[PDB]
Design a protein around this ligand. Structure first.
Ligand SMILES: c1cc2c3nc(ccc3c1)-n1cnc3ccc(cc31)OCCCNC1CCN2CC1
Length: 294
């Protein structure tokens, strides 16, 4: 079947429709950094018609092999398409200078900080909210898997909250189409055998759920990543139920942490389960928003 081939998004051309004048972008504070580079706050003039002056986030390499990785990140983002639970690419500065990737700025920030600041409220922040976040992330991950994308860095730091409490997944760069790494979120196959699949991301989703239902807790609390950590996880060690987690959600985590990647639940499958855990009215409202967005 030489006539049938795989279209690598890395070999596809860059549509210049995404180019933004570097003189139209004002850069500001460092919002943060992931595995590589940094994300800074910025103001863009002329990117949106509705908003002539719009606040944005900019992914860029730090002053310190990464340039093309950034370009690849741009490429995957360009071809992923739009989704409500996936942060949006607004444009890029790729000509005559360092690569700048312009992305949507989310008001409430990352879930980790949100969950932390609204911890005491958890007695604003409500259990239903947590489940909603869980559902939306599952949907966005389903979208990425549909697009044959393995994020490789699913975590609460990379799940953002936009206005309307709509979650957005961010931080590609470690993403691949079917270096320091986020071990406590990585599956055993990925760490020991360098194998990454959608199922590996499912493991990360479980770690994410523990983060959410621990209200911002650090995975494997107190444990330092070392020889013993790996031996334990290899032997089958798994984290215990988080304090604010139901048996039903912990079960989801347990499934996600099966040693057999093929036995872990799919994001499609994961979506339905969480749906049941929430009011059936939720699905409809979600769909409405998910149609308006487009
Ligand atoms: C990679 C890593 C990121 C990204 N972030 C973005 C946009 C694209 C990103 C790409 N983005 C959007 N609106 C934000 C509001 C706050 C913010 C980042 C925001 O940083 C605050 C918390 C820092 N924690 C992580 C730092 C790196 N992050 C994800 C969050």
């Amino acid at each position: 079947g030489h006539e049938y081939i795989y279209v690598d998004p890395m070999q596809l051309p860059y549509d210049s429709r995404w180019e933004f004048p570097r003189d139209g972008l004002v850069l500001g504070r460092v919002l943060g950094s992931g595995a590589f580079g940094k994300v800074v706050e910025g103001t863009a003039y002329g990117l949106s018609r509705s908003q002539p002056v719009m606040k944005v986030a900019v992914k860029m390499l730090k002053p310190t092999s990464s340039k093309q990785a950034l370009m690849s990140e741009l490429k995957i983002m360009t071809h992923l398409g739009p989704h409500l639970n996936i942060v949006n690419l607004l444009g890029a500065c790729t000509k005559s200078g360092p690569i700048y990737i312009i992305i949507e700025y989310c008001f409430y920030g990352d879930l980790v900080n949100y969950l932390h600041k609204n911890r005491d409220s958890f007695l604003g922040l409500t259990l239903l909210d947590l489940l909603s976040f869980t559902y939306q992330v599952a949907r966005g991950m389903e979208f990425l898997a549909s697009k044959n994308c393995v994020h490789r860095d699913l975590a609460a730091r990379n799940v953002l909250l936009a206005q309307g409490k709509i979650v957005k997944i961010c931080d590609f760069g470690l993403a691949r189409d079917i270096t320091f790494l986020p071990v406590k979120w990585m599956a055993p196959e990925s760490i020991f055998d360098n194998l990454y699949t959608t199922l590996s991301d499912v493991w990360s989703y479980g770690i994410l759920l523990w983060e959410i239902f621990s209200l911002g807790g650090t995975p494997y609390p107190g444990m330092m990543v070392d020889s013993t950590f790996y031996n334990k996880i290899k032997s089958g060690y798994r984290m215990a139920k988080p304090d604010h987690a139901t048996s039903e959600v912990y079960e989801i985590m347990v499934k996600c942490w099966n040693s057999e990647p093929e036995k872990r639940p799919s994001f499609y499958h994961l979506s339905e389960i969480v749906e049941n855990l929430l009011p059936g009215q939720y699905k409809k409202s979600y769909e409405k928003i998910h149609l308006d967005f487009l």
